[PDB]
Write a protein that binds this ligand. Structure first.
Ligand SMILES: CNc1nc(C)c(-c2nc(Nc3cccc(N4CCCN(C(C)=O)CC4)c3)ncc2C#N)s1
Lengths: 252, 308
């Protein structure tokens, strides 16, 4: 449905991984780390942040159905990224992706002979895993990301380049750091990002002549109660993330 | 080793009745849902390779079928796996326009031909409005349901478009392929599908593909012998085509579209619309919106439901 890949908090506690004894906090790390692997490979493979985000969402959803105990993120991430690049029209060659993943996960080891048995197996493994991803996602690969909506929203409130860049930053970090993509629609998340960027910059968007707040123009459901609740959550994990905040911190 | 799989059902839920796809189109089966009797079409995803996992071409089609939801566009119900391979499952369509037309027993009234063209053009309007080019407009890809509803089918070569594009030139079956492509254009749009609708419209009376080339040059010759010859006067700027000097086509031809089809197509409006579909310059070629507005659909006999 339109409810298929969105989950209640209770559903999120009962993840496939919990059912195999993985703590909640541990599981969030497993996500975070996969998203990091995706970011790292994606940048080395020279694919867009959009494609990385698509792979990241695939990853999120994949693990609402599968367990980290059966499928380790170091296995899924490359397959997920391989797929996302195909889907997003920046196809990267299978060998290339295997190679980059190898250096990422084993900087010090050395790539096997592309003629070897060991290598041929890992080529086959990735292809198999791409297939388990497709099947897990029921071939639903068209992803909507908050960012499209960020640009829309930050223009229709005349934000500086800076504010807009920060809002896009939040958006991307929401994918790496939170399960918001599994709980809230892209446009709602975008409001959360613009909210936090504002709070962080000491920018306030003045109430419209009608008495309507900016976010109402973007999503009928959205409430300041919810925005404050969510920005709080997102900001917390940002604080926990070494160096992330530095990137948008006004040092002047 | 037996993984959870809530959203991808095994194709064994369907019971194969019959191949209907041999040769080119791929393996296509008629099937029956084992519980409800619901008839469907199964297309397997061919893995001649890939060297590259799940075919990017199949991903594209799946993306496009999932986007397109309309009475005149074939309906992808779901994608199924197998107890490794993959099947696209569609609502079944009883007829196929190519079969109907190649069947001497089957007979269309002017009224029904109007209806067919109306549904087809309305399907095109929808897919284009949704930024999709079908790129394989031809009678054999047009289905009709037991209840007389036309569906555009086979999105396997279709592609999203936008607004200097470098789309692929090797698109559309040769007999239905528009001048632009034959002259090497890679920045083309919706007009290529409409040229094809033209060829199909004419085919509703001639019961046979009007222009059956053997090579691109033969095709361009046939096209010239019908639509006049490619002239910068007729087609402004047809100049800057590499293959333009190099084409060695005709030079004296004049538009015979209405004369050569005058025989088969009684109705004047019909001939006028076909003429406006088979226009050489893609930019002067009628679009689905105007075509739907054409008097052919708004004069007697008005379009009627299908039963022949
Ligand atoms: C592009 N080929 C096609 N793929 C699918 C999945 C098709 C399809 N077909 C039907 N029903 C149907 C009924 C009668 C004939 C056909 N033809 C057989 C004769 C014509 N033909 C060619 C190449 O000339 C091929 C198929 C098909 N119903 C639903 C779908 C769908 N989707 S057609």
């Amino acid at each position: 449905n339109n409810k298929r890949w969105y989950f209640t908090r209770e559903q999120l506690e009962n993840s496939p991984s919990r059912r195999f004894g993985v703590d909640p906090d541990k599981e969030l790390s497993y996500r975070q780390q996969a998203a990091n692997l995706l970011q790292d490979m994606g940048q080395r493979l020279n694919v867009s942040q959009l494609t990385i985000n698509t792979a990241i969402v695939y990853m999120h959803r994949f693990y609402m159905i599968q367990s980290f105990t059966r499928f380790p993120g170091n296995s899924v991430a490359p397959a997920a990224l391989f797929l996302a690049a195909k889907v997003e029209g920046q196809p990267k060659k299978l060998e290339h992706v295997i190679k980059v993943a190898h250096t990422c996960l084993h900087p010090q080891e050395s790539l096997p002979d592309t003629r070897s048995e060991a290598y041929l197996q890992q080529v086959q493994d990735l292809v198999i895993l791409e297939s388990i991803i497709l099947q897990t996602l029921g071939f639903e690969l068209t992803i909507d990301h908050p960012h499209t909506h960020v640009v829309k929203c930050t223009q229709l409130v005349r934000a500086s380049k800076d504010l807009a860049q920060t809002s896009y930053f939040m958006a991307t970090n929401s994918l790496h750091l939170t399960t918001f993509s599994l709980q809230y629609t892209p446009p709602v998340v975008a409001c959360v990002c613009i909210h936090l960027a504002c709070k962080w910059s000491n920018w306030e968007i003045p109430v419209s002549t009608d008495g309507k707040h900016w976010w109402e123009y973007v999503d009928a459901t959205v409430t300041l109660e919810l925005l404050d609740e969510l920005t709080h959550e997102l900001l917390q994990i940002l604080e926990k993330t070494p160096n992330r905040l530095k990137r948008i911190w006004n040092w002047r | 080793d037996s993984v959870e799989c809530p959203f991808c059902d095994e194709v064994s839920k369907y019971e194969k009745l019959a191949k209907i796809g041999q040769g080119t189109f791929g393996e296509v089966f008629k099937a029956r849902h084992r519980k409800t009797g619901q008839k469907v079409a199964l297309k397997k995803v061919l893995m001649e390779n890939e060297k590259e996992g799940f075919p990017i071409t199949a991903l594209r089609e799946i993306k496009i079928l999932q986007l397109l939801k309309h009475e005149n566009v074939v309906n992808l119900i779901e994608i199924c796996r197998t107890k490794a391979s993959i099947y696209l499952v569609f609502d079944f369509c009883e007829h196929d326009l190519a079969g109907l037309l190649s069947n001497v027993l089957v007979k269309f009234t002017l009224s029904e031909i109007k209806r067919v063209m109306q549904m087809l053009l309305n399907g095109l309007y929808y897919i284009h409005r949704n930024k999709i080019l079908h790129r394989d407009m031809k009678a054999a890809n047009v289905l009709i349901t037991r209840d007389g509803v036309l569906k555009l089918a086979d999105f396997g070569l279709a592609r999203a478009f936008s607004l200097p594009n470098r789309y692929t030139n090797r698109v559309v079956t040769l007999w239905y392929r528009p001048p632009e492509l034959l002259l090497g254009e890679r920045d083309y749009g919706p007009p290529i599908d409409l040229w094809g609708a033209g060829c199909i419209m004419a085919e509703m009376w001639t019961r046979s593909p009007i222009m059956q080339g053997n090579t691109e040059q033969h095709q361009l010759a046939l096209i010239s012998q019908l639509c006049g010859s490619i002239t910068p006067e007729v087609w402004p700027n047809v100049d800057n085509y590499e293959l333009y000097e190099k084409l060695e086509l005709v030079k004296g031809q004049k538009r015979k579209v209405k004369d050569r089809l005058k025989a088969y197509v009684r109705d004047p409006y019909a001939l006028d619309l076909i003429d406006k579909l088979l226009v050489l310059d893609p930019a002067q070629r009628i679009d689905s919106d105007d075509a739907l507005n054409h008097d052919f659909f708004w004069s007697d006999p008005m379009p009627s439901d299908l039963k022949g």
